[PDB]
Design a protein around this ligand. Structure first.
Ligand SMILES: NC(=O)c1ccc(NC2CCCCC2)nc1
Length: 271
């Protein structure tokens, strides 16, 4: 209503129900909007985000809508901390979900998680929108077991320089292609590379990529042309798909449309 733009939610419409955890920007809670609608509420710690830039970008994110993309519902920016209001994902972070061995996943379920993410990324690619930090830690799982891509583009607004460049202690070295580590060249093809690593994370049930190496050692390994190798649960065909994401030459890496086709083909053959 009065005083709120289309990208703005009235925080008074929120009912807080459960604490879900704390991440980069701070706490995330489960709640309801206007009594009935499930939402997640991301409370953005003061000093952690370039807030004016993020708010302008939220207007763009409002228009991104895909079944495999965690939906942005709006922002609460009239006070601090500001809130980001999103779709609720009852089963939490993908990385944690993978690591719970009780699920006893079939490989068909693992491939479906990859397809979920690939569909979201194909959609983002169709909108010329880069994720910029794709990884299992940035995917979420709903009550139906569907994986969705989360926090797309949000790394652009992080003020902690330890996260923001390779010269940083918290940069996602293990999800970055050589041209990012060497020259900071981000593109659709750096998202493609990251997606391959995410496939590896899924098929590895949430192991850390290059688990015996430091970040520094990982950068040397990949810049020297070496790669992750095949997770035990990945068939040859699945391995071929993730490996294709890691061509040294960015322009030899597939698009998300091509990866989706390849994933569907393997589903059909492995079903
Ligand atoms: N959209 C959601 O429902 C939702 C659910 C859990 C969650 N967990 C985060 C994992 C990393 C630490 C902070 C909590 N983040 C978002």
């Amino acid at each position: 209503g009065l005083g709120y733009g289309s990208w703005e939610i009235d925080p008074k419409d929120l009912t807080f129900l459960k604490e879900l955890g704390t991440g980069q920007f701070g706490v995330v809670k489960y709640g309801k909007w206007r009594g009935q609608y499930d939402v997640a509420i991301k409370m953005i710690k003061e000093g952690s985000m370039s807030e004016d830039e993020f708010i302008e970008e939220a207007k763009v994110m409002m228009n991104l809508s895909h079944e495999k993309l965690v939906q942005l519902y709006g922002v609460c920016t009239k006070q601090r901390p500001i809130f980001i209001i999103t779709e609720y994902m009852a089963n939490g972070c993908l990385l944690n979900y993978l690591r719970e061995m009780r699920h006893r996943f079939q490989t068909q379920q693992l491939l479906e998680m990859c397809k979920d993410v690939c569909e979201a990324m194909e959609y983002l690619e169709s909108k010329q929108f880069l994720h910029r930090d794709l990884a299992a830690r940035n995917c979420l799982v709903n009550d139906q077991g569907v994986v969705k891509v989360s926090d797309f583009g949000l790394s652009r607004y992080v003020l902690d320089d330890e996260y923001t460049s390779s010269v940083g202690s918290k940069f996602p070295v293990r999800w970055s292609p050589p041209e990012v580590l060497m020259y900071s060249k981000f593109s659709s093809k750096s998202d493609i590379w990251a997606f391959g690593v995410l496939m590896w994370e899924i098929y590895s049930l949430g192991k850390m990529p290059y688990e015996r190496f430091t970040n520094s050692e990982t950068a040397e390994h990949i810049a020297q042309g070496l790669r992750l190798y095949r997770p035990h649960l990945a068939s040859e065909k699945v391995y071929t798909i993730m490996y294709s994401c890691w061509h040294e030459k960015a322009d030899e890496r597939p698009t998300f449309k091509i990866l989706l086709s390849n994933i569907l083909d393997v589903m059909d053959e492995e079903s």
